[PDB]
């Protein structure tokens, strides 16, 4: 009562504000019989969202 | 006059070459360009200050 604590009101966030991420569950069948491996953008290391 | 060719302003100078492609430059790109415009004139007229 003579001296109480203080709360932390101002707090900053530099990353992008989200809470819902997207997780891959099973893998994909990139080497396959039907399509060649040159159709997929994963063969060229193109970064995708 | 030279920054109005690569950027967009309302200052009219007569658009003497437009067939050459470029981008609508922002302040950082225009400042980097203007630094070379500065240092070429300083180098030629032999100033240090």
């Amino acid at each position: 009562l003579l001296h109480a604590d203080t709360p932390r009101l101002v707090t900053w966030d530099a990353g992008l504000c989200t809470s819902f991420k997207i997780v891959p569950i099973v893998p994909a069948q990139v080497p396959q019989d039907v399509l060649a491996y040159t159709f997929f953008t994963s063969s060229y290391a193109i970064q995708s969202p | 006059t030279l920054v109005a060719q690569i950027s967009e302003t309302q200052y009219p100078v007569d658009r003497y070459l437009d067939w050459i492609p470029s981008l609508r430059a922002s302040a950082a790109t225009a400042a980097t360009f203007a630094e070379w415009v500065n240092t070429s004139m300083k180098t030629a007229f032999d100033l240090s200050d």
């Binding site: 399509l35 060649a36 040159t38 159709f39 953008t41 060229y44 | 067939w19 050459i20 492609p21």
Partner: protein, 98 residues
């Protein structure tokens, strides 16, 4: 907006017009350079076999470009694929060789 679908079971592979039709890899086309500069490695796998021996004309709209010209003896044989493909493999998402 150019999306490439491989032809299935012997069909010709197709690419999308600006109107919406899919067209095969023949005839006379018009590109901005930004299309290639977006896809500089995917299109090399797709088109280099069709430009070299097939029948495909691509007009890449640029406006301005620096050039380096080689001369050849006109009484000899001359093939410019080793220069043309060398340029097409090297134009990249940032820069362009002459």
């Amino acid at each position: 907006d150019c999306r490439i679908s491989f032809g299935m079971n012997g069909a010709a592979p197709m690419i999308r017009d600006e109107t919406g039709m899919m067209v095969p890899f023949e005839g006379n086309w018009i590109f901005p350079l930004a299309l290639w500069q977006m896809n500089t490695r995917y299109f090399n796998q797709q088109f280099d076999a069709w430009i070299k021996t097939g029948e495909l004309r691509i007009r890449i709209e640029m406006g301005a470009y620096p050039y380096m010209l080689h001369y050849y003896d006109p009484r000899q044989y001359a093939n410019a694929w080793n220069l043309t493909s060398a340029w097409l493999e090297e134009i990249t998402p940032t820069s362009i060789p002459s």
